Amino acid sequence: MWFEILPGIAVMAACLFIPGMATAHIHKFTNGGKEKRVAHFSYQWNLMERDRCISGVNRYHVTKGLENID
Amino acid sequence: MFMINILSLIIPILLAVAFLTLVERKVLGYMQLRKGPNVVGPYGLLQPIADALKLVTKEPLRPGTSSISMFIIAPILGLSLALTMWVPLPMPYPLINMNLGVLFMLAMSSLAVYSILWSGWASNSKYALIGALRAVAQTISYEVTLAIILLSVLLMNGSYTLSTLITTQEHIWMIFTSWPLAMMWFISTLAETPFAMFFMAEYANIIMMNAFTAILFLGASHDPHTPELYTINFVLKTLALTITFLWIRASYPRFRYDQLMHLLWKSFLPLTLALCMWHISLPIMTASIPPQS
Amino acid sequence: ASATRVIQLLRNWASGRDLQAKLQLRYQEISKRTQPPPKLPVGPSHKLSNNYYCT
Amino acid sequence: EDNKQFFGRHRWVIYTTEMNGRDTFWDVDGSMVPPEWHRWLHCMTDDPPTTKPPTARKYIWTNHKFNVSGTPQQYVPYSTTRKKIQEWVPPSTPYK
Amino acid sequence: RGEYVVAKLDDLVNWARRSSLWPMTFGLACCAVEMMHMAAPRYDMDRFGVVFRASPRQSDVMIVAGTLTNKMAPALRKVYDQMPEPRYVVSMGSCANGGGYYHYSYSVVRGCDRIVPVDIYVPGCPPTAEALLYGILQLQRKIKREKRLRIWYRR
Amino acid sequence: TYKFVNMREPSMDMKSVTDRAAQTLLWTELVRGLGMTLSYLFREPATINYPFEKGPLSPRFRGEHALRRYPSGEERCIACKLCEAVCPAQAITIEAEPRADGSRRTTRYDIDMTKCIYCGFCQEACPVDAIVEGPNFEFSTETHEELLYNKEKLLNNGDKWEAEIAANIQADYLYR
Amino acid sequence: RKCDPHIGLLHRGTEKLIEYKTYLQALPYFDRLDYVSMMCNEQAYSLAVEKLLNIQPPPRAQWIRVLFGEITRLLNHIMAVTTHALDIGAMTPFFWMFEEREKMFEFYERVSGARMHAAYIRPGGVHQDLPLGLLDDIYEFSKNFSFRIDELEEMLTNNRIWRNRTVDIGVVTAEDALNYGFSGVMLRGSGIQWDLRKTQPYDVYDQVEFDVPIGSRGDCYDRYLCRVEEMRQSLRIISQCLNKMPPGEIKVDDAKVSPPKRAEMKTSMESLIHHFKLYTEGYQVPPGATYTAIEAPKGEFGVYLVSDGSSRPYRCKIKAPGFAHLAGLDKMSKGHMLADVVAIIGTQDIVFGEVDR
Ligand SMILES: CCCCCCCCCCCCCCCCCC(=O)OC[C@H](COP(=O)([O-])OCC[N+](C)(C)C)OC(=O)CCCCCCCCCCCCCCCCC
Ligand code: SF4
Ligand code: SF4
Ligand code: SF4
């Protein structure tokens, strides 16, 4: 019957699904919460380098808000 | 862990390349009153394993008049390409957010012609020589329609950054603004697409072309917090397109070469130019030029 | 036959033709496979008189 | 047996596990069907042996055999006739 | 034990080889169009999964169907040479099996055997669809009972 | 009585040319092709499961041959040699002999199964219904020698396929 | 520029072994001649032999011959178009229609007992009777057959890619075609108003109503249209045939040409003697030389049979329709691109069974 196609499509749908979910989840992980900041222009990149420098632990995703300044 | 993410893409795509074949045969089967693979495992679930390990156990005969060096690097490029354009896809968040992703996709996908060109030359047979010649001219004819469609599409997008496509569509599917181009684009994708490899190379091209068409024309809403929404929508859209891609595989007599060139250069290229002219002035026409940044 | 109404109106619309009127395969429209005994007819020469093969 | 299935699929089977000293759990062929039911299964009639068994006769096999090719029990042909031009029998004696 | 491992690897390999054939069909005579009738939906010779054309190099079993005349004698033998191992041929029909209805003709080799070695002899004139599909199943079981890896370890 | 198959001309009114331009610019007859096979996709398949069920046959089916015997167990063959004479591929070779009892039946009966053509002339030639083709068709082999039948194998099949032969000939002796 | 075909790759000594087999043994060769259509070849051989024998079949036999003659026409025309469809691509009509051929094979199975090579039509009529309930299934399939053929047309008639690959690609003019010995679809495709069933109605074809689908232009698309309308114009013939099936004996009442009934054989001696002699040497055909041709489903199939005056044919030459058709392969493949040649043989409708003899 025509619905026997679905077991065929379902597994590859999972096979196609895994790359998307894995990339999003590892982005959340290796960047610790906030997604991987995107630097399409030198302005965003030097922003990121400022974040890495200001973190003091060489991790751009570490953010120091109002508790840092005096 | 970034390396793990690559294997978390290449292998499942490789399996995805492996596993839609049973979808093809059973869709193509059930279409013609047939059943498709259903005796090997439940509903042919194990049919892909039934063929792959058989193929790797089959000895790869090599023609006597074959240049081994080219005969083994042409599949190397063919697989290397077929698993490389999967990397910049804006699927939730792309592995590589290249600011020129569309250009990179085109340059590296247009490189696939070398594999078939080398295969025909390295094989060194009368059949292989013409077949390579026919395949390449059919292919090299069709980037000009590919490039113009994508170029003219991207005027209302904003840039070649593939991630920006999601922001552009958001409200409506982008087909509603360029549906004359969608049929223009979709048809051109059909024709552009050792022997054990060549299954994998063109086949990832088949799904990725539809994945590429999915993001381009039928976008989705990417919620910043929950990414699974875009994952399901992207997969569902690229499945419907691929089913259509095989829907037409067994629904038309195959094109003949003289019409194949005639169809493009006399009925596809001139109309593609007009639509590009329509979509280059219309953002200017309505003061709706998009932001690149 | 089996196929529900929802699948039916999909296949009628996609084809544009009423396929349920006649199917390409037979559910119960055939002759019963075994048949009652027959009685074959006779011909123009199964007579005993003026059937001389010479004429 | 069914009537809802279409013609050619209305009557069907799954096979036994043991067939004359041969396990049958994965492999299947069409020759284990006994003749009495071979008529009913192939839709050649409509009276199963339960309803209409075959006429009992001595020479009819009491145990149907499936196809045997590829096994130590094969078939091997041979001349069924008798020897002709029989070699002249020589006597022995010592000699003359 | 290494004997157990070679047995499992034997079973794993041929299970594919008994489920993924590709028939290079030799369309010659009424037995050949009868094959395509098997690939028709009524019997579905593609559900087990062997493609109807399969091309020359993309093929495993060559179904010799039809009368084999000396006209085609060298063409098939050169084709059988190009068929990569493991390669099997199933002689279909009385004409291809021994000659059939043209055994005494001047322009036909009596049986496809005299040209190539055959694994399965399916009889018929023409053989009924399943009668050859059963023969394919017979070749399927013939692949189940091979000792390729087992013989290598034994040597 | 003859009927033209291509003499229609396309009307040049605005409606028809609009139909033609709409037909090609945005493909419709091709989309109609998609719709037809889609309806075919949402339809039951006609593919039977072999050998779990097979296509229907008829009582007149001609397949693997088998000699028969009388209810007494006495063979039907009388070595009248009719089947050999009519056998169009000369697959019948038989030799008779004055059997010791006095019934004098055949000594040899070899059917060259790979020469036979399953034409069914042999059964209709026999005046005592000795040689018949059983409904079996799955009797393939891996050896040429297996196909070449003989009197013993023919008798064995008659002992094996007897329910079908008796029943099929019972459903057919009025027909032929 | 060159279109000389290398043929004989199937050739068997058909005529040579016909010279040594008796007429009854000669019959199965024609079933094996065209490996696309079986039964309509028996019509040609049978019609020739009865004409020499000066024996006509009973009216019951005549209608069964035409009924199975038409189902053969469907059978050949399904295979011809579907194989035409396959070589271009378009595998779906190939599968969908081949499902229906299974029904007609079962019809062949029910009457003759064999799937393809029926050997059902013999000099003097049909050997076996029509099984009870057979014509109802013919009515069942025929009623549903038209619906399938519209599905073929719906996918195929207006398809631009098929049409464009089959319009004006391969074309032969009226005088070149008719001079080349063409027949069947090609004369009708070129516009020639000729058809053996209408001009010289053999058997019972005089008492039936149908039309001959001829067309203009002469290219292969119209030949494709000619076959399709033949399907419908065939379907009306079976519709009238099973509506007007007369009651009578299946074979001639002449025991010297028709073997007696089995009951007669085992009861009356002259039945036993005649069957004995009919199955040792058979009837002796009086000397003569007739070329009888019929409207074969693919063309005009004829046999030129000379009779020695004994129980064997002196020489029987087969007029293979494809043999004349393939002879013109040069003419209908002149100038067109290489990719279209397979289309030409697709519309040339060459089966290797009879062109290679
Ligand atoms: C204010 C409005 C501004 C914009 C207006 C734009 C113009 C109006 C609309 C024009 C027509 C529609 C757009 C162009 C379409 C193509 C035009 C063309 O050349 O057509 C004729 C062309 C050529 O037709 P032809 O060759 O028969 O005739 C062309 C004309 N001559 C004879 C002179 C050469 O059609 C094709 O090429 C047929 C299809 C080929 C591919 C086969 C598969 C088709 C599958 C279809 C179903 C799937 C569709 C998927 C769509 C996408 C989904 C994501
Ligand atoms: S065995 Fe019979 S059906 Fe097969 S090719 Fe030979 S003659 Fe034709
Ligand atoms: S069916 Fe076979 S054995 Fe019988 S007469 Fe014909 S060729 Fe000879
Ligand atoms: S099988 Fe019949 S025809 Fe042949 S020799 Fe025996 S009795 Fe005579």
Side-chain angles (χ1 to χ4, degrees), chain E residues 23 87 89 113 154:
Chain E
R87 46 159 148 81
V89 317
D113 156 73
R154 177 133 292 100

Short mmCIF file of all heavy atoms in Angstrom, two decimals, chain E residues 23 87 89 113 154:
data_model
loop_
_atom_site.label_atom_id
_atom_site.label_comp_id
_atom_site.label_asym_id
_atom_site.label_seq_id
_atom_site.Cartn_x
_atom_site.Cartn_y
_atom_site.Cartn_z
N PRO E 23 20.29 -8.09 -13.23
CA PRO E 23 20.29 -8.94 -14.43
C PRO E 23 20.56 -8.19 -15.73
O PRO E 23 19.79 -7.31 -16.12
CB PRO E 23 18.89 -9.55 -14.42
CG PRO E 23 18.04 -8.54 -13.71
CD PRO E 23 18.94 -7.69 -12.84
N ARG E 87 29.78 -13.70 -11.35
CA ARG E 87 28.85 -13.65 -12.47
C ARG E 87 28.22 -15.02 -12.66
O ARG E 87 28.91 -16.04 -12.62
CB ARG E 87 29.54 -13.19 -13.75
CG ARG E 87 30.86 -13.87 -14.02
CD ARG E 87 31.23 -13.77 -15.49
NE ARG E 87 32.68 -13.69 -15.68
CZ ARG E 87 33.49 -14.74 -15.67
NH1 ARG E 87 33.03 -15.96 -15.48
NH2 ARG E 87 34.79 -14.55 -15.85
N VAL E 89 24.85 -17.05 -14.98
CA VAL E 89 23.91 -16.92 -16.08
C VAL E 89 22.82 -17.97 -15.93
O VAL E 89 23.09 -19.12 -15.55
CB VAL E 89 24.61 -17.02 -17.47
CG1 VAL E 89 25.90 -16.22 -17.48
CG2 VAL E 89 24.90 -18.44 -17.83
N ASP E 113 24.72 -23.78 -23.08
CA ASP E 113 25.81 -24.39 -22.32
C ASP E 113 27.10 -24.43 -23.12
O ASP E 113 28.18 -24.17 -22.58
CB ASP E 113 25.41 -25.80 -21.89
CG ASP E 113 26.61 -26.68 -21.62
OD1 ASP E 113 27.28 -26.48 -20.58
OD2 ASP E 113 26.89 -27.58 -22.44
N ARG E 154 40.03 -22.72 4.90
CA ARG E 154 40.40 -24.13 4.90
C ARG E 154 41.72 -24.35 4.19
O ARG E 154 42.54 -25.17 4.63
CB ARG E 154 39.29 -24.96 4.26
CG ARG E 154 39.60 -26.44 4.16
CD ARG E 154 38.43 -27.29 4.65
NE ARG E 154 38.22 -27.15 6.08
CZ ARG E 154 37.30 -26.38 6.64
NH1 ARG E 154 36.47 -25.65 5.91
NH2 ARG E 154 37.20 -26.34 7.97
#
